[PDB]
Design a protein around this nucleic acid. Structure first.
Ligand code: M4H
Ligand code: MG
Ligand code: MG
Ligand code: MG
Lengths: 48, 221, 740, 179, 60
RNA sequence: ACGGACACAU
RNA sequence: AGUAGUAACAAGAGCAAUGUGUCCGUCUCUGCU
């Protein structure tokens, strides 16, 4: 279910998944930063 | 009002406010003071979290611009998105799951935060909010336009500068509601419909037993 | 780590059409665009598979087969071919590739099939270690009813099990809802610990858990046992004319055995009272009866079942009685008083006509089990006084709903709001007393303000409960108080000693009449396990539909023997023990009035020659299995209790119960052919009749040379030499003379 | 023997047999009497008290929680944007696409009743703009039978429906023979 | 069961001639409005749309 | 939940 | 011609509803003892 778009749902899920993985020690800080910057690049495209 | 809110708040705050009003099924021009109150709640929820980081050593810092945020912002997102966030957090930190959707989550103190913004007294709305939220280990924080804020159990996890900046912004917004006159309607404002458009109304009028000229006359009969 | 999917999403967002779709389609609209199909629809897969298997390559598989399966068989078959495109991730595959993999592919040490499909291996273990008895041939009376094809978990319903499955398999996707049971929580923690480090796909895990936890039902025609392990072999165990005796492999279920012990107890109790020694027959039947191929008296020495008819079977043998009955699962133990049951036609709260069964008579109660206690003073439709106890404050509030359903006054029967159908979707009669129970559990505001208040005196040791949830010390509801310590244990949970007599009334060493046979609930449930009353006092399978057919089936084949007993010394014929289980279908006050009518009909067939109807002697004969009365009243039909519904049986002509068929030359009972009586139609089909009316002779069809018409009840003031026209029943009139 | 009228919106000839002359033989008739229908429904309500209210409450609870994708449960649906049958999910996706291209964005909430509000609001649109499947024919030679055949190539094309044409398509039931 | 013994009982095995062609959407409109009597008027207007649309239908 | 097959009525 | 049957195929675009129930599943060849 949902009213947000598929892309917003995917980016929100990717951000919270990377944050929970960084809290649980299952990824590194560089991987967390690279996932968050990939999400910011996708949002830079999605703005246009 | 309408143009007051669109001249006073940031475009992202108004964007999330418009998306929130649309998700709850109401245009911003039909409810203008509710749009202003929603933009107020969103702006306080964003000033609670902006430039507030946790470093690699677990110590909260305040910046201007290799850091991770201290707060996860749950107010503003869609409802199932926010429940995905809340469920993932409750499954990592194995706590109880809140019954209502909160507004923030603090990773440092590991606590869900609820933010209220009032025009009335702080303590009455605070006790009604603590009665509505009775049964959960949330942290309530009520801010007012008057310049007072109430915490939960007189404990503070935010510092002095950020809370003073929130109260400064709320005092400036309250005085801005006075000079354009729209504080009388603001401070004193706290079902399904299905109509027929005119072409379908004429189609309805032509769909009856032959002794009826109106669909509503037949519905009354 | 999650970097690949965000890189792939970046790659897809860089395409313009994909970005427009991902930014304009919501999650709700993705359910619509997921099923978008623009080609022509493929129809007829049976015909298509018939001709596609003549081709070389009917199978489409992924391109990884090019690395796993060679292009050439040892026999020289081509196993796969590349498609007409260039960069397709899909190859066309011959079924010889499937045979090559099954004979020469990589052997795996890890197979997942016995864990995912553990339900079917449970089924095969039940069949392989099962035992077959003989096959008996008789008319199977199946009844269509809702049974379980998957038993599910006992602690869960279907929706609770689906929410447990979502919490176990996909815990971060459950949304707003939580798990609202402690049983859900324990099953969820158990399944989460069981399914750690599983390399199975999560959807297959979810379907495996649905095979384990979700209860499925279907409407099926069942003749025997209805537990879920006897329903899976329903194709093997029953047919239209035969029954295969089968015991499944393994240990039986406890709640299934607890139910079918009660049903087998009530049959043996109800059969026994229409014997000449109701104790010696009950002991003869209890020692031979078996449940799921296990003897009854070995079950009656280890079962904690507290029921009224079970207690007669134990007090006859010598097992000690834990005297209580169960509503809602609580021990409803009586103290003092005595009642008797007789149903009536009362009205309910949703304006529906209901046939309730209300216990008329004073009964003192000590109702207590596992959470609280209650001492209910109660008579006829009157909750007088209930000093109810508890352990926690909230568990008294739910048991307050429990007692006020059992009260059944003229207040709770008319304080029902909502929709409470006492029938189901197949017009099947649900029992009423459990339907008010499951309804008032969450709708309780109509049972707290219609009940009112009653004034009380300030005595210590007593608390109160208001309508609005207030504990009080000045006023409270009618007949309900609140205590603190209550009544202690080891007096309800002691199995006391008793003694039985010749007529099964169970009294203790003091002389409290604790069980009488008149207090046995005369309901016919369907059992979860089969019951073999291997006795000469019963029939093969019990049931009110089976007692009707088997009795008439026995008179028809023994008709050459029974007609001679009917002709001379007829009272030896009426006293047959084959005729005795038929009397459990007749109501109690109707038995002596029916035999007195029937034997009076049978005597007029003898004193008037030529009026011998062998088809009507057969029909009336198992209604004479009782000492008669001298009540000269007229009957047009005899009622018969089958599943609560009183079926009528007409003295003259066919019915839905006893239908003679001239075309087949047969008697049809309840839709089951029970055999040709004697085939003596030419000696039969007379004119004068004598076994329809009491003291009257039907003389042919209707004729108005004698005056007006009468009815069956209005023939009391007649005389000698006087004929008349009477509506005989079923839309016709006959000339009728009251004889000398 | 009923009344004939011309529809003001579609322009069609409509026959009204309701409350018509009572039949005088045993032929099939369509002259149903509205008062007798209302009397029978009133008797059904009288013999079943609380039936209509319970059923209406269940329908009210189900209206508010029904999504648009429930309409994808169907089989072959008449697609008014193509004047042809399509599968139900395809037909719904084409309808939602044409609606949101024309400014009917209530169905973006995902509830079925907002889609129904958009369906009723689209009849006021004076000019619908839909996407149609056209074809481009070309005479080629078949390579395995040496016979000149016609190559059909389907593309998309945007047309403008009128108000009456859209209203006729929105009330159109496509027909076929039951096999 | 709901019969006395002085009663004939006959069963019709019945079909109806041209069932769908002799039904009427205006009668369905009256049925829907009487079933939903005393209900919210948005609900009565929503449930009336399908008989109104079937009263004005065309057949391709 | 979704899909397929079959039956029946329209 | 033939299949067929209220209209078609005999090559040159293959037109599958609604409601209910039951059952199953989860992406260059032709050989039935
Ligand atoms: O949405 C929440 O979680 C939330 C909502 N408010 C109420 C307001 N509000 C915002 C969106 C919304 C939707 C429906 C009803 N009230 C809504 C915010 C200001 C004006 C009303 C207050 C809190 O403190 C919350 O935490
Ligand atoms: Mg909020
Ligand atoms: Mg808030
Ligand atoms: Mg018909």
């Amino acid at each position: 279910i949902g009213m947000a778009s598929m892309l917003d749902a995917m980016l929100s899920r990717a951000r919270i998944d990377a944050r929970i993985d960084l809290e649980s020690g299952r990824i590194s800080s560089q991987d967390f930063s690279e996932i968050t910057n990939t999400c910011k690049a996708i949002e830079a495209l999605k703005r246009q | 009002m309408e143009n007051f809110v669109r001249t006073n708040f940031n475009p992202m705050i108004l964007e999330r406010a418009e998306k929130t009003m649309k998700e709850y099924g109401e245009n911003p021009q039909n409810e203008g003071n509710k749009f202003a109150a929603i933009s107020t709640h969103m702006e306080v929820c964003f000033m609670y979290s902006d430039f507030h980081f946790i470093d690699l050593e677990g110590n909260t810092i305040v910046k201007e611009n290799m850091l991770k945020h201290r707060f996860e912002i749950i107010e503003g997102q869609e409802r199932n998105i926010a429940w995905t966030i809340v469920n993932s957090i409750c499954n990592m930190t194995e706590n109880s799951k809140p019954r209502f959707l909160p507004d923030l989550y603090d990773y440092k103190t590991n606590k869900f935060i609820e933010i209220g913004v009032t025009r009335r007294k702080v303590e009455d709305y605070y006790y009604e909010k603590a009665s509505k939220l009775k049964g959960e280990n949330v942290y309530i924080h009520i801010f007012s336009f008057d310049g007072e804020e109430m915490a939960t159990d007189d404990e503070y996890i935010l510092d002095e500068e950020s809370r003073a900046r929130i109260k400064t912004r709320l005092f400036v917004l309250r005085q801005e509601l006075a000079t354009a006159g729209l504080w009388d309607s603001f401070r004193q404002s706290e079902e399904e419909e299905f109509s027929y458009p005119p072409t379908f109304q004429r189609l309805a009028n032509q769909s009856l037993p032959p002794s009826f000229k109106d669909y509503h006359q037949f519905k009354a009969y | 780590s999650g970097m690949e999917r965000i890189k792939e999403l970046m790659e897809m967002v860089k395409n313009s059409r994909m970005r427009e779709i991902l930014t304009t389609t919501s999650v709700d609209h993705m359910a619509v665009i997921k099923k978008y199909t623009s080609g022509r629809q493929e129809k007829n897969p049976a015909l298509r598979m018939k001709w596609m298997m003549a081709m070389k390559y009917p199978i489409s598989a992924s391109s990884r087969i090019r690395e796993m399966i060679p292009e050439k068989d040892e026999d020289g078959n081509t196993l796969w071919t590349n498609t007409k495109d260039a960069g397709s991730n899909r190859v066309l595959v011959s079924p010889n590739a499937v045979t090559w993999w099954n004979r020469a592919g990589p052997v795996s040490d890890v197979v997942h099939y016995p864990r995912v499909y553990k339900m079917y291996f449970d089924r095969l273990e039940r069949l392989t270690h099962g035992t077959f008895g003989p096959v008996k041939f008789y008319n199977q009376v199946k009844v269509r009813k809702r049974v379980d094809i998957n038993p599910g978990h006992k602690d869960l319903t279907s929706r609770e099990a689906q929410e447990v499955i979502m919490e176990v398999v996909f815990p971060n996707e459950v949304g707003a809802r939580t798990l609202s049971s402690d049983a859900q929580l324990t099953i969820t923690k158990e399944k989460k610990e069981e399914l750690k480090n599983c390399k199975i796909s999560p959807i297959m895990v979810a379907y495996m858990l649905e095979r384990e936890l979700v209860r499925r039902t279907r409407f099926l025609p069942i003749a025997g046992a209805t537990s879920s392990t006897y329903v899976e072999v329903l194709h093997l165990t029953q047919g239209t004319c035969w029954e295969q005796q089968y015991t499944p492999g393994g240990e039986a279920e406890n709640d299934d055995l607890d139910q079918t012990l009660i049903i087998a107890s009530r049959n043996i109790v109800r059969r026994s009272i229409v014997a000449i020694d109701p104790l010696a027959s009950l002991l003869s039947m209890c020692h031979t009866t078996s449940i799921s191929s296990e003897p009854l008296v070995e079950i009656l020495r280890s079962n904690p079942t507290d029921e009224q008819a079970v207690n007669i079977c134990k007090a006859a043998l010598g097992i000690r009685i834990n005297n209580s009955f169960s509503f809602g699962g609580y021990n409803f133990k009586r103290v003092k008083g005595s009642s008797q049951r007789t149903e009536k036609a009362v009205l309910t709260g949703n304006l529906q006509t209901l046939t309730m069964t209300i216990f008329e008579g004073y009964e003192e109660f000590n109702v207590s089990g596992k959470r609280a206690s209650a001492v209910l003073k109660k008579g006829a439709q009157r909750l007088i006084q209930a000093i109810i106890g508890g352990r926690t404050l909230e568990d008294i509030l739910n048991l307050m709903i429990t007692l006020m359903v059992f009260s059944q006054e003229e207040k709770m029967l008319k304080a029902v709001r909502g929709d409470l159908n006492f029938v189901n979707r197949a017009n099947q009669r649900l029992n009423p007393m459990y339907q008010l129970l499951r309804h008032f559990q969450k709708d309780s505001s109509t049972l707290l303000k219609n009940w009112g208040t009653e004034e009380i005196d300030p005595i210590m040791g007593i608390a109160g409960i208001m309508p609005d949830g207030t504990i009080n010390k000045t006023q409270t509801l009618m007949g309900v108080r609140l205590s603190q310590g209550g009544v202690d244990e080891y007096s309800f949970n002691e199995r006391i000693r008793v003694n039985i007599d010749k007529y099964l009334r169970v009294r203790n060493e003091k002389g409290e009449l604790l069980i009488s046979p008149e207090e046995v609930s005369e309901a016919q449930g369907q059992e979860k396990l089969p019951i073999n009353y291997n006795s000469s006092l019963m029939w093969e399978v019990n049931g009110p539909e089976s007692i009707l057919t088997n009795t008439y089936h026995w008179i028809i084949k023994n008709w050459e023997l029974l007609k001679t007993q009917w002709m001379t010394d007829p009272t030896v014929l009426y006293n047959r023990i084959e005729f005795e289980p038929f009397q459990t279908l007749i109501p109690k006050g109707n038995r002596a009035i029916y035999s007195g009518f029937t034997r009076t009909l049978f005597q007029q067939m003898r004193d008037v020659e030529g009026t011998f109807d062998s088809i009507q002697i057969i029909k009336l004969l198992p209604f004479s299995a009782h000492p008669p009365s001298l009540g000269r009243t007229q009957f047009s039909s005899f009622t018969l209790n089958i599943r609560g519904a009183p079926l009528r049986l007409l003295i003259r002509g066919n019915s839905q119960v006893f239908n003679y068929n001239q075309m087949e030359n047969v008697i049809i009972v309840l839709g089951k052919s029970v055999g040709s009586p004697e085939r003596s139609i030419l000696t039969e089909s007379s004119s004068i009749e004598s076994a329809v009316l009491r003291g009257f002779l039907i003389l042919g069809k209707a004729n108005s040379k004698y005056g007006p018409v009468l009815t069956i009840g209005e023939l009391d003031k007649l005389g000698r030499g006087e004929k008349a026209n009477v509506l005989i029943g079923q839309g016709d009139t006959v000339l009728v003379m009251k004889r000398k | 023997r009923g009344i004939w009228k011309t529809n003001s919106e579609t322009g069609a000839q409509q026959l009204n047999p309701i409350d018509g002359p009572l039949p005088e033989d045993n032929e099939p008739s369509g002259y149903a009497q509205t008062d007798c229908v209302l009397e029978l429904i009133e008797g059904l309500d009288r013999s079943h008290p609380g039936l209509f209210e319970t059923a209406c409450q269940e329908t009210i609870d189900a209206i508010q929680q029904t999504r648009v994708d429930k309409l994808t449960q169907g089989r072959q649906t008449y697609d008014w944007t193509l004047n042809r049958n399509q599968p139900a999910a395809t037909a719904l996706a084409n309808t939602i696409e044409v609606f949101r291209k024309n400014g009917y964005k209530l169905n973006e909430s995902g509830r079925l009743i907002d889609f129904l509000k958009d369906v009723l609001l689209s009849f006021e649109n004076d000019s619908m703009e839909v996407t149609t499947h056209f074809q481009k024919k070309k005479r080629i030679r078949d390579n395995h039978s040496k016979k000149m055949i016609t190559q059909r190539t389907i593309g998309k094309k945007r047309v403008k429906l009128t108000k009456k044409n859209y209203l006729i398509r929105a009330l159109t039931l496509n027909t076929m023979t039951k096999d | 069961a709901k019969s006395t013994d002085e009663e004939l009982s006959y069963t019709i095995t019945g079909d109806n001639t041209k069932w769908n062609e002799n039904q009427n959407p205006r009668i369905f409109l009256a049925m829907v409005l009487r079933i939903t009597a005393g209900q919210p008027e948005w609900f009565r207007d929503l449930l009336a749309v399908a008989p109104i649309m079937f009263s004005n239908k065309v057949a391709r």
